[PDB]
Symmetry: C2
Subunit: 421 residues, 2 copies
C-alpha cells in the first residue's frame, strides 16, 4: 500500500471524498488519486517519490513552471513584512497599474479572493449597469459554482442543475450552445431587453479545450453592441496564457468586463475583475453595487514578478511552439497506432480527444468523444511519468519550463500508451 | 503630501475608490486611508514609517500578532516545495484532522478560498439536506456578499438591499433582529416548513461587537431542533478567537454547520465549512451538491494555519487575551467617565466593541445604530494621532492579539485620554 493510498484512506475520515477539490478524487479517470509533496520546473513529485511531467500546472497559474526562483525569492522577501494587513498597500497599486497596462480593456480592476467571486461581482455590475436581470451563459462553460450558474436551460429561462438551489435563483439564467452565434442572435431577438450580460470563456477550458469558431467572439461583441448587453470574458484560464494580453488579445475582440484567475497571483489564490471604467465605477465604495470578496501581499509579490517575467519578448511564441511540437508528436503516434485522435490548441492551452471528428467545435463534439479510452490513456500516461488533467473534460497547460527532455518523456510515454490501447 | 496620500491619489486611476476592499477607503471614518508596508507583533507600520498599536489584526487572523517567527518559518520551509505543488496533499489531511479535533461539531470539513464561498456552500448544503428553500439571517450580520444575502426584510420574505440583485434572488431570505429569540420562534411558527437554515454570527462582529444575549444561542438551537432547521454558525471572526473552540465552545451551543476562516490560514486567504457528517457528505464528489470556491488547500495557508492552530492551543492562551482586553476596556471606560463622555463596551474573548452610547448595554442592532457614530469617527482619528489603529468603522469589531502587553496598553490608554479630552 503506497503512501498515496494510505493518505487517501486517512483523508476520507474528515474530508468528504478525501479531497478538498472534487476532481482530485479521480472519479473522472478511475483509481485512487496521487498525493503530491513537491514541484519544480515542469515536474511534480508524488508522496511515493515518483516524478511526473506536469500538464495541469495547478490548472493554469504555473506558466513559469513550478518554483520559479525569481517568484519564490519575491515571496520570501515579502514574507519578512507580514502575511497580510487589513489595509491598502503599494503592491496593490503596482498590480492594478500593471494589469491595466497589459490588458487594454481593463480601465479599472479589482482584486478578490477567487475567480468565483470575480464572476459574482462582474455579473452583479452588469446587472446594476443595465438595470436588467437575466444573463446568457454557454453549456459546458464554468464560471464558478454560484447558485444562479448551477442551472441548465428551461424547457422560466433556466432551472437548477443540482440540489440545494432554489428554482427562483435559476429563472434569470439562459444557457445557449457554445460556438452557436445564431442561437445567441435568436435569443437576444426574443428577450434581449432582459439580458444584462453574456458571459463566456473565450476559449472553453472546462469541457476540455474548445477554441472559438470563426466569427463567434466577433459575433458576441456585435450582438452585445446591438442589444446593449455587457460582454464578459472569463479569462481565469486563458488570461496571460493564450497570449500575453489573453484570449481577447489573441482573437482581437474587446470585452466590456473580464475576470482573471490565479496567474495574476503567480500561483497563489486570488481572482480579479475589471473592464470599462463606466461599468467599474458602480462598485462600492464610490458606487452602489456590492463586491463579492473583501490584495494579499504574497500573491501581489508573486504576481508582479510573474507578469513581468512573462512580458519577455517571444515568451508566448516559445510556449506556443513547444505546445504545437507536443501535439504534433502525439498526433503522429496516435496515427501510427490507428487510434482516432484529434487535438485543439490556443497558445499554451491544449485539448486531447479520442475522437474521429475532424475538429472539436461543439459541446456535442466533446461529449461524443471516447471518454473511456481517455481514462485508460490517463493511467498509461501516469505509468510513463506524465500527469495530464485527470478528466476528459479539462484543458491541459504547458509551461516555459517544458523543454526537449520533457517533450521526449511525454512522447515516449504516449507511444507506449497508444500501443497498449 | 504624505506617502499614503500620494499612493491613495495614484490608486484612484485604476482601482475604484483607490482600494480593493471598500471599507479600506476610510469612508466610514473620513479622511484618506493609511497605506501599510510592514507589521510585527502588535504593530503596523504605514508608508510614512509611523508605527501604530494595531486592533484590526488584518480583521481577525493575526491573533498571534503579525509576523510570528514560527509561522513565518513554517511558510518559508513550505515555500521550498512550490507555491502550488498540485492535487491533494498531506498537509490538507493534517489540517482537516486538526480542525475536527479542536472543534468537535466538525465531523467533516472542506477548505475553500474564502468565507464568502464557505457560506455559499454551507447554505446550499442545508437547502439540499432539508429540501427547503428559505433561510433566516439577522440584521447587521455579514456572511459574504452573495446575491441572496444582499437583502433586507420585505414589508415575499426579502427584497434586495442594493442594485444588481434580482428581486427573485431575495425572496427566500428572511431578516430578523439579532438577539430576538421570540421573533425567531414566531417566524418559524408561521413558515418553519420553508426554512432550510438559520445562519448567525454567534458574536456579531460586523455591526461592531455584539455578544449574544442570555438564552439567544440556546434558543436558536432548540428552535432549529423543533422545526427541523439546520443551525449554521458563521465563525469566520469568532473561530479560534472568542475561545480555542470558538464561540460554540465558549457559549456551549453546538451548531449543525460552521464556517471558518482568518485564523485557520494563519493570515493567508482561506475559508472552511464543516459540521455534521450526514449533512457534509452531500457535497461533491460523493454527494450531489456542488461546492463554491474549490481550491485544494493551498500549501502556504495550510502550513501557516497548522502552525498557528498549534501555537494558540498553549494552555491559558485565550484567558490571557481576555485578561488584557478587560484591562483595556476598563481603562477606556475609566477615561471616558473621567471626561464625561457616554461610553460602553462589549467583549467576547479576543473580540471587543467600543461604543459612544449612554445605553446600559449593547444588545440589539438598533442599539448599535443609535450610538454616537460621528463621535467614533473623531475618536478614530484622534487615536491615530496617538499611535493606535482601531477599526476604521463604527460598525466593525476590534481584535486583540497575544502580542499586546503592558507597553501597548500604556500607549492605548494614554492615547485615549488625550482623545477624550479633544472630543468636547
Amino acid at each position: 500500500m503506497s503512501r498515496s493510498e494510505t493518505l487517501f484512506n486517512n483523508a476520507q475520515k474528515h474530508i468528504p471524498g478525501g479531497v478538498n477539490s472534487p476532481v482530485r478524487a479521480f472519479k473522472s479517470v478511475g483509481g485512487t488519486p496521487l498525493f503530491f509533496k513537491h514541484a519544480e520546473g515542469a515536474y511534480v513529485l508524488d508522496e511515493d517519490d515518483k516524478r511526473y511531467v506536469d500538464y495541469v500546472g495547478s490548472w493554469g497559474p504555473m506558466i513559469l513552471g513550478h518554483s520559479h526562483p525569481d517568484v519564490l525569492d519575491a515571496v520570501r522577501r515579502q514574507l519578512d513584512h507580514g502575511l497580510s494587513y487589513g489595509a491598502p498597500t503599494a503592491l496593490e497599486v503596482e498590480m492594478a497599474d500593471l494589469v491595466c497596462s497589459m490588458v487594454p480593456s481593463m480601465e479599472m480592476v479589482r482584486m478578490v479572493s477567487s475567480g468565483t467571486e470575480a464572476t459574482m461581482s462582474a455579473i452583479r455590475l452588469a446587472r446594476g449597469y443595465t438595470g436588467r436581470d437575466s444573463i446568457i451563459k454557454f453549456e459546458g462553460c464554468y464560471h464558478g459554482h454560484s447558485d444562479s450558474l448551477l442551472v441548465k436551460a428551461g424547457s422560466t429561462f433556466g432551472v437548477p442543475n443540482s440540489p440545494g438551489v432554489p428554482a427562483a435563483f435559476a429563472k434569470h439564467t439562459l444557457t445557449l450552445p457554445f460556438n452557436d452565434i445564431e442561437a445567441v442572435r435568436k435569443t437576444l431577438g426574443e428577450v434581449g431587453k432582459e439580458v444584462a450580460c453574456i458571459i463566456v470563456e473565450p476559449v472553453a477550458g472546462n469541457m476540455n479545450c474548445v477554441p472559438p469558431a470563426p466569427g463567434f467572439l466577433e459575433g458576441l461583441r456585435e450582438a452585445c453592441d446591438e442589444h446593449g448587453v455587457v460582454l464578459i470574458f472569463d479569462e481565469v484560464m486563458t488570461g496571460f496564457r493564450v497570449a500575453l494580453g489573453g484570449a481577447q488579445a489573441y482573437y482581437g475582440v474587446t470585452p466590456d468586463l473580464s475576470t482573471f484567475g490565479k496567474i495574476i497571483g503567480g500561483g497563489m489564490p486570488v481572482g480579479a475583475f475589471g473592464g470599462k471604467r463606466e461599468i467599474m465605477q458602480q462598485i462600492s465604495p464610490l458606487g452602489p453595487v456590492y463586491q463579492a470578496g473583501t490584495g494579499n501581499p504574497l500573491a501581489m509579490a508573486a504576481g508582479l514578478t510573474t507578469l513581468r517575467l512573462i512580458s519577455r519578448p517571444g515568451f508566448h511564441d516559445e510556449l506556443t511552439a513547444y505546445t504545437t511540437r507536443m501535439l504534433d508528436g502525439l498526433q503522429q503516434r496516435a496515427d501510427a497506432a490507428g487510434i482516432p485522435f484529434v487535438t485543439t490548441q490556443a497558445g499554451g492551452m491544449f485539448g486531447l480527444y479520442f475522437s474521429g471528428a475532424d475538429a472539436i467545435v461543439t459541446f456535442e463534439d466533446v461529449m461524443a468523444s471516447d471518454v473511456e479510452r481517455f481514462k485508460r490513456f490517463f493511467h498509461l500516461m501516469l505509468d510513463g511519468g506524465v500527469y495530464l488533467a485527470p478528466s476528459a473534460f479539462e484543458a491541459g497547460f504547458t509551461s516555459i519550463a517544458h523543454g526537449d527532455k520533457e517533450l521526449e518523456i511525454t512522447l515516449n510515454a504516449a507511444e507506449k500508451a497508444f500501443a497498449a490501447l
